[PDB]
Amino acid sequence: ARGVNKVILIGNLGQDPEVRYTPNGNAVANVTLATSTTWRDKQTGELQERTEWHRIAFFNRLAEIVGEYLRKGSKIYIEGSLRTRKWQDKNGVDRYTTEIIANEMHMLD
Amino acid sequence: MARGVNKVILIGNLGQDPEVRYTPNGNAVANVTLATSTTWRDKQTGELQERTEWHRIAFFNRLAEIVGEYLRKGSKIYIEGSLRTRKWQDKNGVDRYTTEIIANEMHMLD
Amino acid sequence: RGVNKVILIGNLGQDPEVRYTPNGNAVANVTLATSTTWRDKQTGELQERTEWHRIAFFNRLAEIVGEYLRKGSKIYIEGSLRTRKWQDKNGVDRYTTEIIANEMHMLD
Amino acid sequence: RGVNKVILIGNLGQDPEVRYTPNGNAVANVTLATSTTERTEWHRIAFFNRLAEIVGEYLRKGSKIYIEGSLRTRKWQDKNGVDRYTTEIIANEMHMLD
């Protein structure tokens, strides 16, 4: 190639995997994944949880694995790549919707 | 010490010269658009063709300052950061995720 | 100018000992095991290879590790590679490569 | 099970050189320099097959590249048959930054 496009996530499945098949027997799976980090309340010192949400897509073998083993709550590790579909704002500002294309996946439960 | 891991690593070029602003308190804030390339093989003809993804990146404070001063359209950079997503609601009522990369690190690659 | 990153997930080989440096700082040296399993694409079959990594935790991270982690604990690590030079008893330069941990997350 | 991953960006210490293992395969062992505000770290990296050929063709001393790989420590004996150990990076992917 010439560029690097790489995401590493650890988080939980927000719902049970949704598995489907292309009209020619290809596995496709879509999951929602929540990753968390902590935040310190400045006033009170309370350690509070912050959550980001990500859409992940798996293909073929990996998608089969996902639907075979993973359920809501499942904690997994993931490497993948960002894929974005260009936008346009109410104010005409270019925006970016992002799915993660998964190439690796390690189960952690 | 968080329960999760949210890491992006990118290498690519600025589509445009950086956009920079300051907050009412002075602190800097920069955004750029990054193109990252890979290569696709045309299965029929064997042609080596370039595919491009586009990314919105936000920088803050000192990093933003560095970006304003040093970067330009075409600049090749390395980026470590985190994904920040604001949630959607689709035409067909499906959930979508609009993401910005929040940069923690930046190395210029000439 | 340069990137030196290591990401690992695997299990501790021992209960960690927090020690102190000749400068008074906490250190915890541990080993971590990562494994690759694959089937030989012809002759042999189910192959499994294990790698042992040397990890150095310093200061608070050292103390956390000393306090929470135990042998076999499943842990996640980000860090940097450092090789150091020492001498054997006959004065020959020998080398050891270690992961200087930046971050760690408990997966258990 | 387990993640063993390395990412580097730095420069080759020497013009790379394709050689061959006793199995016949291609391989280039090179060193890569990475630095921090200043201390320089030297990594042994190993490319095999295709990557090795590609590395041997296009890279010279001081070539800035990007690498992903896995860590591997192999065991060997010195003259006196004492177990010694070397940590090398087995590269999966490589990109030229020049």
Curated annotation (Swiss-Prot), chain A:
Keyword DNA damage set for record: yes
Domain of life per record: Bacteria
GO terms for cellular component: nucleoid
The keyword DNA-binding appears for this protein: yes
Residues annotated as signal peptide: none
GO molecular function: enzyme activator activity; single-stranded DNA binding
Gene Ontology biological process terms from the UniProt entry: DNA recombination; DNA repair; DNA replication
Domain SSB: 4-109
Chain's role: Plays an important role in DNA replication, recombination and repair. Binds to ssDNA and to an array of partner proteins to recruit them to their sites of action during DNA metabolism.
Subunit composition and interactions: Homotetramer.
Name by which UniProt lists this protein: Single-stranded DNA-binding protein
Gene: ssb
Interval of the full protein contained in this chain: 2 to 110 of 158
